[PDB]
Design a protein around this ligand. Structure first.
Ligand SMILES: OC(C(F)(F)F)C(F)(F)F
Length: 466
């Protein structure tokens, strides 16, 4: 009996579907740079990404050996999203057609001598029975949106976020890891899946029910306690769109910007910082819907992306789609074949700190002592902050009657303090403090003292730029 042998099969499913790989070392200590009156704080930290899932998203419509009820081997091939098919005498099995939100549809059909052709035929009579009357030919309300976003930092971490095919779409996607690492550009990758339907296979009550003259014709197909058999349980059909979004923006509101952008929820309206969207250059690898043969690569601009997703969503059809994701189960215990994958990577985040301008104006019938101070950030080795004391070069200096000077506090500065005093004709209170405050490093700030020795009057004003 086969079931007995299947029950005797002693393997470790999870350990045979594992993807290690760290090779991360240690990232160069965080540093600080000066660029065009701005301060660039570069901080890159070592992180780890993990992905354990039995839902395999496809990529190459040609490298597809996937179909509902497909009997596949459980090996490195299956692990690398390039499984091996076991073409043996197949046992009749029942297939069902699941739709996103079609109430109680779930059309069922029987399948004899299971194979690409037969399954294709079943799915054909299904989809045909569906399109024949139901108003769901070109589009169907809201197909299942499977949105998988992630900021790009490492080919491997992307290989973990999507699998071992992003290595295949990498060239078309054109990702700038060097730039991201340098901190120049910022790029997010988004797996936008748009499932129109989903073919399900009735869980085999028994391996015997799956495969009756199959006495021991298993060892002649590659079945062993070393190479367990799996079967494609569910296959999702729709439009798969792997989009790459690059922008020269900073590390502020980017995620939200991109996500909201891709989701296209009229974010444009009341969009505080939309410079990212005005600087969103994209490149998308799409397949499904528009065609059931080849894929399409489109590089361009934010708008082009919007109109491309909008014209790619409800412009396709339902008649016949392409496999964009699938799932398989072990033949023995019908356990979900959950591929695991780990990957350490480097998250590189930079921060811009603008210059600061402090104008000083003296209009007093007297002599005014000036005294302004602050501290500057120094990023030495070990990536540890080093705040260094700084004071105005003319500090302690006393200015006569009228004076004026604008000062340029660097971006890597903080804890600004201003202290200005005025000389009085008094011997007891020779010096009278006029102004003394801790000040925020706002864009532009003008401080104007003026008036009489017996009465000094000041003015602290703040201005903007652009
Ligand atoms: O790539 C096509 C284009 F260009 F958007 F028209 C498709 F419609 F398929 F998306």
């Amino acid at each position: 009996d086969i079931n007995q042998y299947f029950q005797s099969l002693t393997y470790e499913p999870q350990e045979i579907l594992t993807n290690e790989g760290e090779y991360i070392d240690n990232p160069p200590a965080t540093t600080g740079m000066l660029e065009n009156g701005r301060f660039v704080v570069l901080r890159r930290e070592k992180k780890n990404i993990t992905n354990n899932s039995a839902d395999i998203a496809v990529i190459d419509a040609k490298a597809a050996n996937i179909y509902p009820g497909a009997l596949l081997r459980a090996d490195q091939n299956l692990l690398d999203n390039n499984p091996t098919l076991i073409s043996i005498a197949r046992g009749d099995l029942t297939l069902s057609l699941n739709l996103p939100g079609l109430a109680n549809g779930d059309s069922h059909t029987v399948v004899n001598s299971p194979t690409r052709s037969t399954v294709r035929t079943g799915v054909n009579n299904l989809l045909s029975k569906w399109n024949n009357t139901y108003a769901g030919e070109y589009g169907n309300t809201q197909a299942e949106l499977q949105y998988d976003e992630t900021m790009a930092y490492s080919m491997s971490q992307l290989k973990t976020k999507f699998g071992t095919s992003f290595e295949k779409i990498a060239v078309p996607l054109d990702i700038n890891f060097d730039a991201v690492n340098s901190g120049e550009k910022q790029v997010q990758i988004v797996n936008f899946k748009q499932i129109y339907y989903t073919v399900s296979v009735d869980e085999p009550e028994s391996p015997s029910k799956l495969f009756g003259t199959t006495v021991e014709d298993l060892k002649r197909n590659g079945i062993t306690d070393e190479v367990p058999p799996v079967y494609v349980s569910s296959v999702s059909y729709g439009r798969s769109m792997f989009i790459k979004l690059e922008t020269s923006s900073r590390s502020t509101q980017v995620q939200a910007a991109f996500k909201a952008a891709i989701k296209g929820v009229d974010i444009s309206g009341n969009a505080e910082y939309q410079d990212i969207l005005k600087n969103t250059s994209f490149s998308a690898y799409i397949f499904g819907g528009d065609a059931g043969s080849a894929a399409t690569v489109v590089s361009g601009n934010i708008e082009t992306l919007k109109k491309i997703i909008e014209e790619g969503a409800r412009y396709g059809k339902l008649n016949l789609g392409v496999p964009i994701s699938y799932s398989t189960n072990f033949v023995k215990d019908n356990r979900p074949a959950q591929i695991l994958s780990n990957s350490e990577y480097i998250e590189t985040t930079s921060t811009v700190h603008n210059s600061s301008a402090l104008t000083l104006d003296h209009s007093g019938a007297y002599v005014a002592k000036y005294n302004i101070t602050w501290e500057e950030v120094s990023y030495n080795e070990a990536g540890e902050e080093v705040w260094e004391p700084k004071a105005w070069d003319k500090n302690g200096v006393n200015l006569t009657s009228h004076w004026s000077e604008t000062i340029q506090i660097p971006g890597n500065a903080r804890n600004l303090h201003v202290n200005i005093q005025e000389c009085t004709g008094l011997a007891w209170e020779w010096w009278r403090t006029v102004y003394d405050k801790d000040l925020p490093l706002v864009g532009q700030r003008k401080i104007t003292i003026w008036g009489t020795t017996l009465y000094p009057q000041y003015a602290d004003e703040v201005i903007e730029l652009e």
